[PDB]
Design a protein around this ligand. Sequence first.
Ligand SMILES: [Zn+2]
Lengths: 910, 259, 32
Amino acid sequence: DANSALMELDKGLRSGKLGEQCEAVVRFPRLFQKYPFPILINSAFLKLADVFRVGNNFLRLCVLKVTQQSEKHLEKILNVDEFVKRIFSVIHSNDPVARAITLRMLGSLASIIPERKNAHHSIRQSLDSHDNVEVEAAVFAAANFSAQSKDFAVGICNKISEMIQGLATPVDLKLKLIPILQHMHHDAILASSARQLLQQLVTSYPSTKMVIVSLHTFTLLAASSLVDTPKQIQLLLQYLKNDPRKAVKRLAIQDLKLLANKTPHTWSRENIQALCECALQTPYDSLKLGMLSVLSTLSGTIAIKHYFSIVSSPRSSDLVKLAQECCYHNNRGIAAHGVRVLTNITVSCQEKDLLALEQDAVFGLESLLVLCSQDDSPGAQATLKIALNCMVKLAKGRPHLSQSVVETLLTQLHSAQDAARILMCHCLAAIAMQLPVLGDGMLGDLMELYKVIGRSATDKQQELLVSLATVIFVASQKALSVESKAVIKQQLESVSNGWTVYRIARQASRMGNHDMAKELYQSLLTQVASEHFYFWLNSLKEFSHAEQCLTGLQEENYSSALSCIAESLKFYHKGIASLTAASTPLNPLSFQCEFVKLRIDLLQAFSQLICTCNSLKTSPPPAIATTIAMTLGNDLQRCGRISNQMKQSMEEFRSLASRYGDLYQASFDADSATLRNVELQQQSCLLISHAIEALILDPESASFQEYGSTGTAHADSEYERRMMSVYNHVLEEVESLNRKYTPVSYMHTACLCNAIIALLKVPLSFQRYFFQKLQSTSIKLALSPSPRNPAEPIAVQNNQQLALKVEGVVQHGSKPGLFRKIQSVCLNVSSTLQSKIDNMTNEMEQRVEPHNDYFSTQFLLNFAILGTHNITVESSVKDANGIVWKTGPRTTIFVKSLEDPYSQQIRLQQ
Amino acid sequence: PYANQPTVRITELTDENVKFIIENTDLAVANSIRRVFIAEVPIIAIDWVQIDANSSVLHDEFIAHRLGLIPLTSDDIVDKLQYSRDCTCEEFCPECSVEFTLDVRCNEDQTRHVTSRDLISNSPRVIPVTSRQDDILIVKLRKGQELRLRAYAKKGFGKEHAKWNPTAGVAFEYDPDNALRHTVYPKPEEWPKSEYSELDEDESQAPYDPNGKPERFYYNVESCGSLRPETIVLSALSGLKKKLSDLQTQLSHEIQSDV
Amino acid sequence: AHVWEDNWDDDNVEDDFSNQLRAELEKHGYKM
Ligand SMILES: [Zn+2]
């Protein structure tokens, strides 16, 4: 079929009409991107070279555009000498247009022929011919060959220097001729010669149109060949200070931005000081804006430590004065970059005198808040989002100013005109997500803004409603007030979309307000339309209801606690049934079902453990004293059937922790928050395991003290902080009670019950990968043995070997590198005796690295067994930093095994 | 001016035989389908019989005849192997051949019936059809005399020999009530009905069609057990593709030589 | 960068499943 398409396109080429010839020629790139077969590519390219050697110049332009489009397949071309011989053989024509087209095609073939001396020579000769269109085509071809070669670059730099000094050709051709010197980053001496040439060029031609391209090529040359970055920076600062052309100064802006973004650590203190003096001495607001953007980028980078590295007060440093005056300048963008500089320097450096800068920065910050709150322009909203970035960065870096900045943002919530409110609601949601006290400090005013929403907004009511409901949940992280949620329901039933109120419900499930979540899921359940949607909402409703029941818990009451556990477990059972109902072959809720099943099993283990804790007093010490002597107990020191059940519970909990590790390593696709949350659940399980192991079982053999750092507030969630504090509490209690009592477990059961009660008092946090999933990556992993279309086993002679030829192609549902980028694929293959040491001899694994998104690997299996065997493979996708991440299909192939009749006869004779 | 759209359906499948119906195609194409089942389907059959010592009352040529007429299993290794005549090797090589051995000494008083089971094979994918019921009898041997021989099986088709013909029997027909009137019945009532006939018991004769073509071909393919019938059909169609491709290439080169 | 990184509330980020739910539930557009 591919061959069929090939020669029918060849017949279209052999057709008389140049229209149809153009048709087939421009049809080739589709065939290249359909059939990557290299012999087909080579033959198609050879026919292209033939028709280009004899075509009527419009076919030639079509072939040129075909090459320039499907450039990426060029590297798999075999008959390079013949292809280049035709394409170069049409350059002796007298038609300047044909010569120009041919030279452009040589510029396109630069990827496969970068050494052709005759091509070099033809380009260099046509570079100083007179026909205009071929002169600019020669310039383009030199611009490509100088990129993928070096000796051609030194020839062209000599020729270009000669031409520019030789004064022929007009200024437009000089503009075309300058940018060749960007590709001079192959050696330092070429770089220095070109640098001297460019300095001479700028001093020789003081024109704006000259200087702009000269400076831009010079700076790309230095940024590539990063040896003369200080000379580049000081030259640019000279031209920013001295040259009065405003456009040239804007070039200096947009170039120092590039240098600051690429190589920040090369920026020096005198460079910063000179730029600061220029930014003070400038009269123009726009150029000051550009310089302030440059200083903002440099302040965000590391170079602020260079500027404030000692071996002159920081206040005596000229940067601070400029930053302050421009933050309090009238113009909005100038103020935005000033407060950016202030935020960056405050978070970055910590000296004794910077507290005044902190206060100045925060006060100018609410200045920007009021200005952007009542400006209502697109640029105003951009500067507003900049200010909110400053907020998040300042509050996270320094927790000292948190209460002040939150109350200022609440005053702006009073004083806003319902456009910026969504943005600062997101920002203050972040800030309260870090520090919890910011919500229960001022619960009331956010509810007041919530009640004025309905007659306050008309356009993005849904968006601001969702945001402010998110932050009211964050504020009422504790038990939500019935009156407050009734008001919420009143406004939602007044004006809301179903998708809107669904998003409020999802945020409620995220934070942990499960009663409100239950109500919203009940309403959405009563509407819905479709079946898996109904079952999904119903399951969510049941988990919200069970979590409500779990939050309905009393401290130090074990009977009521186990009753609540039983009720919540009934409701998870209903929910998990409805979740399996929602499950479909498409979008299969694997993570969701498995995670909620593991939560179910954790709570079942908790109920069993507290039941055995209560049954500790069910005469187990009496059974031990009746079966054996209490003194020097034969089964155990203070032996117990209860201790046997403790051993069972410890092993069960460890298995549960292993399943959590399995769930995480099979998930692999979630973000940092969700993966962290699963790690915390496994942390809780292992905490219970270590507690029951180090307290009920042998404490002398335990001998474990938590002599390590714990309790730091580097967490990403208040939920995480709460579980971590519970962990610290349990560790300190078990470390206190490690050696106090005998194994009869007098108050050991009380300590375990306290740990259980705390771990269930911290409710839950339903999370993002349990909800909307991103970076859906997959491995197809098609093996290619002898093809077993049915389940018929594959016969092998069993005397030689067997080859496998496994293949895998990786696919991505979106931008693949959202969180984790695939690096290597550890395939793992093993055998098993299907007809019953389980054929675990061949335990191969191979780490193939996919250079492209397709890979293949050959495996050899050896076996001399009569029976059928199953062969299993695994993907073991291992990421950039290096993690196991057990994902992949794990497919199996049946293999038969028969033997030679001559071999069987010889064995019978044996 | 161009090909129509024929249709394929299959009524039932069994290991020995299959039954299917084809519609909207030419009688010439259907006849060629039957002929390409019969003739050019390549299978594996015993061809080179070397006899070390024969003392049976059956003669050596007869022994070679029956050995060549033994069927074998040729699922896909026939497609893997290459023709013996074309494969460049000294004598037969395992890429183009299969080795067999048969040594029998009847030393018991009872007659030892030499069977197809006793053929020792070199490749497990190829055996006599009977093994994997009563075995195929080869020669009945009296006490005292023996038979020692080596054999090589190669790949051939029915243009050479019926031993390389694998189809036990084809039943190809059309028009179960002679509506196209290809035959004339002097006594159509006395003529017995076909099993595909739908005409009335009183009529037993479809009316003449002034405008029509022979259509709705019925096929009953009975294999000899060497291969699955579906694999036989696929191999026959693949060989037809290969032969037409070779004819196309050669005649295109003939046109190129003419012009 | 955006104001808040862990933002579940954004349009183009959300995937196919509750895109279909969005289509249905925007068609519905009310709660009792
Ligand atoms: Zn051979």
